[PDB]
Design an enzyme around this catalytic site. Sequence first.
Site, mmCIF file in Angstrom:
data_model
loop_
_atom_site.group_PDB
_atom_site.id
_atom_site.type_symbol
_atom_site.label_atom_id
_atom_site.label_comp_id
_atom_site.label_asym_id
_atom_site.label_seq_id
_atom_site.Cartn_x
_atom_site.Cartn_y
_atom_site.Cartn_z
ATOM 1 N N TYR A 75 3.394 22.084 54.921
ATOM 2 C CA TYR A 75 3.856 20.948 55.550
ATOM 3 C C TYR A 75 2.782 20.545 56.515
ATOM 4 C CZ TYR A 75 7.864 18.611 54.496
ATOM 5 O OH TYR A 75 8.701 17.527 53.865
ATOM 6 N N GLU A 92 2.143 17.042 57.632
ATOM 7 C CA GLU A 92 2.294 15.724 58.142
ATOM 8 C C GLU A 92 1.251 15.259 59.209
ATOM 9 O OE1 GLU A 92 6.620 16.548 58.807
ATOM 10 O OE2 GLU A 92 6.750 14.282 58.455
ATOM 11 N N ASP A 128 -7.071 -3.612 42.461
ATOM 12 C CA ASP A 128 -6.421 -2.450 41.949
ATOM 13 C C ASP A 128 -7.330 -2.071 40.587
ATOM 14 O OD1 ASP A 128 -4.774 -0.442 40.592
ATOM 15 O OD2 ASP A 128 -3.029 -1.110 41.316
ATOM 16 N N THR A 152 -5.512 4.516 40.922
ATOM 17 C CA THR A 152 -4.807 6.130 40.800
ATOM 18 C C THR A 152 -5.948 6.907 40.471
ATOM 19 O OG1 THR A 152 -4.543 5.281 38.259
ATOM 20 C CG2 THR A 152 -2.698 5.140 39.907
ATOM 21 N N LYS A 204 -5.629 8.219 35.365
ATOM 22 C CA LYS A 204 -6.251 7.678 34.040
ATOM 23 C C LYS A 204 -7.668 7.877 33.735
ATOM 24 C CE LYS A 204 -3.063 3.713 35.159
ATOM 25 N NZ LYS A 204 -2.337 4.550 36.657
ATOM 26 N N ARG A 212 -2.064 13.288 38.954
ATOM 27 C CA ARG A 212 -1.302 12.193 39.240
ATOM 28 C C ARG A 212 -1.191 11.960 40.778
ATOM 29 N NH1 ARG A 212 0.734 11.007 34.273
ATOM 30 N NH2 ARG A 212 1.939 8.988 35.059
HETATM 31 C C1 LIG Z 1 6.609 14.890 61.981
HETATM 32 C C2 LIG Z 1 8.112 15.028 61.746
HETATM 33 N N1 LIG Z 1 8.467 14.235 60.766
HETATM 34 N N2 LIG Z 1 9.908 14.237 60.551
HETATM 35 C C3 LIG Z 1 10.434 14.788 61.801
HETATM 36 C C4 LIG Z 1 9.388 15.149 62.727
HETATM 37 C C5 LIG Z 1 9.449 15.957 64.035
HETATM 38 C C6 LIG Z 1 8.697 15.100 64.937
HETATM 39 C C7 LIG Z 1 8.199 14.069 64.872
HETATM 40 C C8 LIG Z 1 7.401 13.395 65.907
HETATM 41 C C9 LIG Z 1 6.910 11.994 65.997
HETATM 42 C C10 LIG Z 1 6.733 11.020 67.014
HETATM 43 C C11 LIG Z 1 6.183 9.971 66.753
HETATM 44 C C12 LIG Z 1 5.685 9.290 65.482
HETATM 45 S S1 LIG Z 1 5.094 8.025 65.559
HETATM 46 O O1 LIG Z 1 5.646 7.122 66.390
HETATM 47 O O2 LIG Z 1 5.373 7.378 64.233
HETATM 48 C C13 LIG Z 1 3.240 8.001 65.683
HETATM 49 C C14 LIG Z 1 2.769 8.515 66.969
HETATM 50 C C15 LIG Z 1 1.620 9.260 66.947
HETATM 51 C C16 LIG Z 1 0.930 9.601 68.277
HETATM 52 C C17 LIG Z 1 1.572 9.477 69.555
HETATM 53 C C18 LIG Z 1 3.102 8.760 69.658
HETATM 54 C C19 LIG Z 1 3.639 8.314 68.387
HETATM 55 C C20 LIG Z 1 5.633 10.307 64.722
HETATM 56 C C21 LIG Z 1 6.155 11.675 64.470
HETATM 57 C C22 LIG Z 1 7.318 14.114 67.218
HETATM 58 C C23 LIG Z 1 7.584 15.325 67.138
HETATM 59 C C24 LIG Z 1 7.506 16.259 68.529
HETATM 60 F F1 LIG Z 1 7.655 17.388 68.425
HETATM 61 F F2 LIG Z 1 6.265 15.887 69.023
HETATM 62 F F3 LIG Z 1 8.213 15.440 69.371
HETATM 63 C C25 LIG Z 1 8.435 15.868 66.203
HETATM 64 C C26 LIG Z 1 9.199 17.558 63.861
HETATM 65 C C27 LIG Z 1 9.899 18.019 62.747
HETATM 66 C C28 LIG Z 1 7.683 17.790 63.740
HETATM 67 C C29 LIG Z 1 11.267 15.588 64.342
HETATM 68 C C30 LIG Z 1 11.360 16.204 65.389
HETATM 69 N N3 LIG Z 1 11.532 16.539 66.585
HETATM 70 C C31 LIG Z 1 11.947 15.446 63.427
HETATM 71 N N4 LIG Z 1 13.238 15.131 63.814
HETATM 72 O O3 LIG Z 1 11.903 14.781 62.202
HETATM 73 C C1 LIG Z 2 -3.003 -1.580 37.932
HETATM 74 C C2 LIG Z 2 -2.069 -0.323 38.072
HETATM 75 N N1 LIG Z 2 -1.531 0.211 39.339
HETATM 76 C C3 LIG Z 2 -0.669 1.153 39.329
HETATM 77 C C4 LIG Z 2 -0.158 1.754 38.090
HETATM 78 C C5 LIG Z 2 0.675 3.164 38.121
HETATM 79 O O1 LIG Z 2 1.028 3.606 39.380
HETATM 80 P P1 LIG Z 2 2.202 4.920 39.095
HETATM 81 O O2 LIG Z 2 1.214 6.204 39.300
HETATM 82 O O3 LIG Z 2 2.895 4.898 40.045
HETATM 83 O O4 LIG Z 2 2.733 4.633 37.647
HETATM 84 C C6 LIG Z 2 -0.540 1.356 36.926
HETATM 85 C C7 LIG Z 2 -0.205 2.069 35.561
HETATM 86 N N2 LIG Z 2 0.693 1.259 34.739
HETATM 87 C C8 LIG Z 2 1.093 1.899 33.619
HETATM 88 C C9 LIG Z 2 0.061 2.124 32.488
HETATM 89 O O5 LIG Z 2 -0.789 1.544 32.618
HETATM 90 O O6 LIG Z 2 0.545 2.675 31.530
HETATM 91 C C10 LIG Z 2 -1.651 0.331 36.823
HETATM 92 O O7 LIG Z 2 -1.911 -0.131 35.613
HETATM 93 C C1 LIG Z 3 16.132 15.443 56.447
HETATM 94 C C2 LIG Z 3 14.835 15.350 55.872
HETATM 95 N N1 LIG Z 3 14.788 14.187 54.832
HETATM 96 C C3 LIG Z 3 13.289 14.091 54.511
HETATM 97 C C4 LIG Z 3 12.240 14.995 54.541
HETATM 98 C C5 LIG Z 3 11.007 14.675 54.088
HETATM 99 O O1 LIG Z 3 10.494 14.111 52.853
HETATM 100 P P1 LIG Z 3 9.026 14.512 52.402
HETATM 101 O O2 LIG Z 3 9.030 15.686 51.364
HETATM 102 O O3 LIG Z 3 8.593 13.278 52.175
HETATM 103 O O4 LIG Z 3 8.360 15.128 53.772
HETATM 104 C C6 LIG Z 3 12.249 16.000 55.490
HETATM 105 C C7 LIG Z 3 11.230 16.881 56.093
HETATM 106 N N2 LIG Z 3 10.829 16.760 57.511
HETATM 107 C C8 LIG Z 3 9.647 17.626 57.956
HETATM 108 C C9 LIG Z 3 10.451 19.013 58.321
HETATM 109 O O5 LIG Z 3 11.394 19.248 58.409
HETATM 110 O O6 LIG Z 3 9.478 19.776 58.662
HETATM 111 C C10 LIG Z 3 13.753 16.114 56.323
HETATM 112 O O7 LIG Z 3 13.931 17.074 57.088
#
Ligand SMILES: Cc1[nH]nc2c1[C@](c1cc(-c3ccc(S(=O)(=O)Cc4ccccc4)cc3)cc(C(F)(F)F)c1)(C(C)C)C(C#N)=C(N)O2
Ligand SMILES: Cc1ncc(COP(=O)(O)O)c(CNCC(=O)O)c1O
Ligand SMILES: Cc1ncc(COP(=O)(O)O)c(CNCC(=O)O)c1O
Lengths: 442, 442
Positions: free
Chosen positions: A54, A56, A208, A234, A237, A243
């Site tokens: 992970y 992020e 694109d 992408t 292709k 992918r």
């Molecule tokens: C990364 C992520 N993804 N999903 C999540 C998180 C957590 C999380 C998320 C953040 C987080 C906070 C803000 C933003 S933001 O506003 O988009 C951009 C930003 C960048 C720099 C400075 C300020 C804002 C993005 C992520 C901060 C923390 C922490 F530990 F620092 F607090 C933890 C943890 C599992 C890592 C989180 C908690 N707790 C929960 N519940 O879920």
């Molecule tokens: C201009 C363009 N953009 C994006 C995508 C596809 O994104 P995904 O990877 O989410 O499918 C395609 C493919 N379109 C289908 C084809 O040419 O067969 C495309 O032709």
């Molecule tokens: C409740 C929940 N839903 C969705 C996602 C994430 O989807 P993605 O596969 O797009 O990251 C997370 C992972 N959250 C970060 C963590 O628990 O470490 C989650 O905790």
Amino acid sequence: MFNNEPLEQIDKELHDILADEEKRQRETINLIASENLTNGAVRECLGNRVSNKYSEGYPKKRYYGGNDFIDKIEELCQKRALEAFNVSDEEWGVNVQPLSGSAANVQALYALVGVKGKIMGMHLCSGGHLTHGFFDEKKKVSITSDMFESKLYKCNSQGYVDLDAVREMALSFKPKVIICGYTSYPRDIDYQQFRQICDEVNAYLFADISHISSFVACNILNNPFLHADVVTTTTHKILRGPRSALIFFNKKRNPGIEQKINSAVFPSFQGGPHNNKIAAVACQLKEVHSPAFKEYTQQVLLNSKALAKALISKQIDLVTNGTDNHLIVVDLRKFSITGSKLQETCNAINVSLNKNTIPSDVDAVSPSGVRIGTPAMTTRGAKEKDMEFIADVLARAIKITVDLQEQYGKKLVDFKKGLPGNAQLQQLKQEVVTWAGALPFP
Amino acid sequence: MFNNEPLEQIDKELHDILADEEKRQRETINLIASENLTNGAVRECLGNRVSNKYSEGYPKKRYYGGNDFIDKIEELCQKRALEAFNVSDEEWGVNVQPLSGSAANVQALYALVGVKGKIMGMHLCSGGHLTHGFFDEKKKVSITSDMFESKLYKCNSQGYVDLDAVREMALSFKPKVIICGYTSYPRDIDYQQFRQICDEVNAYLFADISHISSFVACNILNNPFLHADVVTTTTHKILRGPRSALIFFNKKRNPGIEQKINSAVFPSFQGGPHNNKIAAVACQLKEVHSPAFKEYTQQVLLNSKALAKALISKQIDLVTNGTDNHLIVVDLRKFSITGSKLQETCNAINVSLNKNTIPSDVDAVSPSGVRIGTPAMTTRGAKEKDMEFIADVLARAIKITVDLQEQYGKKLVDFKKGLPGNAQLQQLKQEVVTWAGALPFP
Ligand SMILES: Cc1[nH]nc2c1[C@](c1cc(-c3ccc(S(=O)(=O)Cc4ccccc4)cc3)cc(C(F)(F)F)c1)(C(C)C)C(C#N)=C(N)O2
Ligand SMILES: Cc1ncc(COP(=O)(O)O)c(CNCC(=O)O)c1O
Ligand SMILES: Cc1ncc(COP(=O)(O)O)c(CNCC(=O)O)c1O
Ligand SMILES: Cc1[nH]nc2c1[C@](c1cc(-c3ccc(S(=O)(=O)Cc4ccccc4)cc3)cc(C(F)(F)F)c1)(C(C)C)C(C#N)=C(N)O2
Ligand SMILES: [Cl-]
């Protein structure tokens, strides 16, 4: 506390299907313009343990630590991408996290314009993608038509982008973004003229290039990097990667765009990156920049030209009357069959192709053409000479399709009843299988 | 016309970093609650040639043909999902195309409410995910706060969901969807009381069980399927699958929701599915239903309980004073050290964990906790008795962190300067490396 028995043992049911899938791929003449075949190395990355992590955020600005080797990979990938597309990393940035083309396009669109934002794209029926703002009277089919306000420009009756039409729309509609680069467009794009129209309305230029990416990179086709604010592609292709998707942004033309794009991908839309993807893409971008891949890419064009010419030699009509790239669109109207009918016929003979609309089509329900492409067969080692046989096979498929429509009727239900057991198909499938089966297969 | 040299030879630069990544994971005490280690079978699918195929649409309703083997895999996956979560295919449907958890949650949310739609979720600070409508006053951080109108409920000062507050907000805000199931919530959920609140305001019940999915499947925790209209889960955390997501919809409670959800995933948001993902999920889902995986899941909880008890035995405070599941949040305030500092200290000793907010935290920038989980170390063979040593290692890291904050000060730039070379960290990493390195490793 885990099970390390190999796939064959642990899941015999799944493993059989997968081997069957492999066997079909090995014995199919694949004309899907968007398809390709990945080498083992790309597939070694995709099954790598790197996907366990992970990470992020971005390299050096990660939310968690232990991302030292992941950071090296994501940075090596960004580098190779900018190098491959012949852009200075001072002038152009790239995001390597989008999971696929449609995600990447929505993310980029969001960055530039945001919710309720005005976008312009080519209509699906004319050759645009769904992610370019596609909708219907009945429904906003794509999120790009619903989370944004989209307007759609058509090609003319000969299959060409009509720039006069684009300008007429852009001056009245006044969008923040205009998209070019298409899904089933057999010709090059005038990026300069798009760029000129964009400046007139103060609109962003979005290109694109997923279908033609290798052509742009190998400098065989027009370069939208010279004029575009954003370029998406992408990687699966013509590029022949996994992918995934790349988003390129012009830092120099618009500063503050790097943060906008990066935040759109994360955390606006996605969560954790898929590091096996990123590694895999990195592994292909090395190959993209080598001179052997330029060879391959040239071969794709050589083959596409020969195929169009051979199809025209058998009196088959092509949209735009030819190709400048890897793809052809066959207009089937003179034969009074539909693209759906021929697709069905071609699957019965192990020929993968897809139905495609043409300019005369008023609905996507009954498209009047098929679209073929050469990148997959070029990967398997076919040359210009081998294109007459493919053209020949497609001409025999068209004939058999006319024969079966005569015998069983024009209803799609009835037509398919004709297809199983037909002696001509079995014979034609067998020849297809014999030739296809022996071609090099990564 | 392709290169078939292995990854090592073709791209030695990349292959070394992957070997380095492989080494780091094998030598790390991984407490990231969302991480796990996939088996060879799951990774053989991810490297499979099935990813070569463009199969937009659904099984038997594919845009192109040549999808007979792809259709068998996508159907075997859907079946195995419903079996794994003990639901009848007559009452519940499942979409297996979402590329990751954040994609899945947006797709499901858009299906239910559409653009401008009202949603409710738990605040990120309080343990919710970004995709549950997370924003800041400064910016709509997640698309879920921008493409929807979101309101966020808070957990109480002890770290528990306060259902009175959920009701108070629900009746006032009048959303169409309320989301429960969380990213860093150490306790089970009252889905019945969520349903009752949802029923009161005519809102959908959305359960995101990505963190707890194994517990739900194995019947160790509350079943949200009894009360929820929609259930989303990732497959890569406690479930031990590839990086993907599942969307479950309750057909019986709402007919005509199958089409809403399926249309949302494609073509509203995504294009072609990633069939290697689909095949990999199928492979893990067979394993999920076995009784050996129930044994593993039980063990994750045994370990999680024991770890909490050991951490309490060393006078360390946990949020909610314990755990019902696989995860713990350590409250570090009594030590006057931040989560960020302890993350840095732990990366230095090869202990993977992440910083996390606690209820007293006002801002996300300086979180006062760390989050740990057992799924990964349980996968690596650790038993109840091994938890005291892990708790011992974290205690030593906490003390080392206090010692370093004493010597170099509270500012993070200064603190990290103390980190490299420190005799105790080098000692602690050594033991971490010795014990970690000899555990079973898929
Ligand atoms: C990364 C992520 N993804 N999903 C999540 C998180 C957590 C999380 C998320 C953040 C987080 C906070 C803000 C933003 S933001 O506003 O988009 C951009 C930003 C960048 C720099 C400075 C300020 C804002 C993005 C992520 C901060 C923390 C922490 F530990 F620092 F607090 C933890 C943890 C599992 C890592 C989180 C908690 N707790 C929960 N519940 O879920
Ligand atoms: C201009 C363009 N953009 C994006 C995508 C596809 O994104 P995904 O990877 O989410 O499918 C395609 C493919 N379109 C289908 C084809 O040419 O067969 C495309 O032709
Ligand atoms: C409740 C929940 N839903 C969705 C996602 C994430 O989807 P993605 O596969 O797009 O990251 C997370 C992972 N959250 C970060 C963590 O628990 O470490 C989650 O905790
Ligand atoms: C799959 C896909 N993805 N991106 C694309 C396509 C193509 C395409 C897309 C569609 C398509 C049309 C509509 C919808 S819909 O509005 O969601 C529902 C609907 C479908 C059929 C009939 C009535 C309603 C979804 C997909 C139809 C066809 C065709 F060949 F059938 F005509 C082709 C081809 C590359 C396959 C296409 C073209 N041509 C273009 N340019 O881009
Ligand atoms: Cl993948």
